[PDB]
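Issue: ligand-bound run for biotin - logging full I/O for the record.

Environment: standard queue, default settings, no custom constraints.

Inputs:
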Amino acid sequence: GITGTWYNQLGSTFIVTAGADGALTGTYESAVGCAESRYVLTGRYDSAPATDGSGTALGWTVAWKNNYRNCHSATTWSGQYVGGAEARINTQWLLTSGTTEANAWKSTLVGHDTFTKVKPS
Amino acid sequence: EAGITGTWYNQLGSTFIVTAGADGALTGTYESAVGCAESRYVLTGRYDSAPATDGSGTALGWTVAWKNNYRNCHSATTWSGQYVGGAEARINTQWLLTSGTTEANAWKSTLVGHDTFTKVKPS
Amino acid sequence: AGITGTWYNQLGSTFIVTAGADGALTGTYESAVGCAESRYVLTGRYDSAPATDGSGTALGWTVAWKNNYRNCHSATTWSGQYVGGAEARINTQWLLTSGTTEANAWKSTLVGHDTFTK
Amino acid sequence: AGITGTWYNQLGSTFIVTAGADGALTGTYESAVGCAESRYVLTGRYDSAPATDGSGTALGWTVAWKNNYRNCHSATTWSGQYVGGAEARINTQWLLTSGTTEANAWKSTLVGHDTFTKVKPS
Ligand SMILES: O=C(O)CCCC[C@@H]1SC[C@@H]2NC(=O)N[C@@H]21
Ligand SMILES: O=C(O)CCCC[C@@H]1SC[C@@H]2NC(=O)N[C@@H]21
Ligand SMILES: O=C(O)CCCC[C@@H]1SC[C@@H]2NC(=O)N[C@@H]21
Ligand SMILES: O=C(O)CCCC[C@@H]1SC[C@@H]2NC(=O)N[C@@H]21
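Outputs:
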């Protein structure tokens, strides 16, 4: 149930296909930051999750370069898909910017995004 | 020789074998020296294929879902960081390891850490 | 009067805090989850002269998970910001470090996020 | 406990701490980087009765980045463990939250890792 169009609390759009091989492929469009238009994503998910009520572990990466704007940064989301009547993907993320060695201590932002198939309002 | 493409090792002795594609793709295998993992796991990721021209590192990230034919750990790790070139080439990362959990156990689903990768084989 | 009070998070944990004029946070934490049993000492710091443009007040605190009931050999730090008003919130991210052997240090630290309501 | 003293991280920042009998950490922090200027107050907690199986001692502390010289409208928390041995170490991960508007809250928090030893930089 991972395949589809997802939205987070910021109103960003996460369009993803979950392949039989455990691959995630798609596009991400951020409502915030330096990003402009859709960016390529790739990731992985557990294609045979536990059947004890546990969620399905997954992660994906966006490098923030496309033909519109290169932000010289990359975000990875790590989380789990939680199935049901109102499906959710709950994630934590790390956004690393390319920095000088002197500035490496401030290279990485951390946050958390929750994704639903309904766009928040 | 120089570049992201190659075989990398972290401080734990894990092996990260990666090819950096022309269009920003990272593809390869990861073998962890620690945890539930056994043998090689598929990785995919992305990197900035046109980094800044001011001495900055190259932003990148990748994911391993910890399922292969040896063991399924029902977990996934993402590494986010940057590649630093030169004579002491590094990939410096922070990571998030999320385990599949029940909703009641979700608060303790995610480990955080940091891995530094070098092309030098451990001694 | 804003930060000072009793707060609950999404897990149902209880956060009792006094924000002093000197920038100090002092109080007790009781977790709804995990190894912890009963109230634990907290101490922390907050920006005692924040911006008023809609910007939150930066803060953080620590609990070492040792009391007379259970010693969990762990500590959590919460880092975040207080947002004032009738629906006041403390929005945090946290790091929970367990005492580990050097071999297990790679899996010493859990990360998460807690939102507190007054 | 071995925690009490002056510690230095990989950035050259100075961490002057006292570990009290009641589990308290008190002292000052001076960052070599960022908006911070001069010494800032810290407070924290540590496990005053750790395991005896070779495990580290869990601890954490907070600095709010306000002093008489500069207020950065930010706060860092370090969470980690003290590791005894030939060269003692405090290994930490940290979260640095800046006061932001609601619309900017997604980019409020930096994450990193600091390792402290008692070796003064030369
Ligand atoms: O500003 C940049 O460097 C690129 C855009 C980053 C947007 C971040 S990624 C994590 C968070 N979740 C979102 O949907 N957007 C922000
Ligand atoms: O135990 C698991 O759930 C799977 C193996 C996790 C290994 C982690 S990933 C982050 C860290 N870096 C490594 O090289 N290994 C550990
Ligand atoms: O299990 C332990 O080691 C001690 C209790 C940890 C409880 C954690 S702290 C962060 C999160 N927020 C809570 O209110 N409880 C959990
Ligand atoms: O820039 C600020 O907002 C205040 C100074 C932050 C300095 C950070 S705290 C984490 C890291 N470790 C250090 O010693 N300095 C930086």
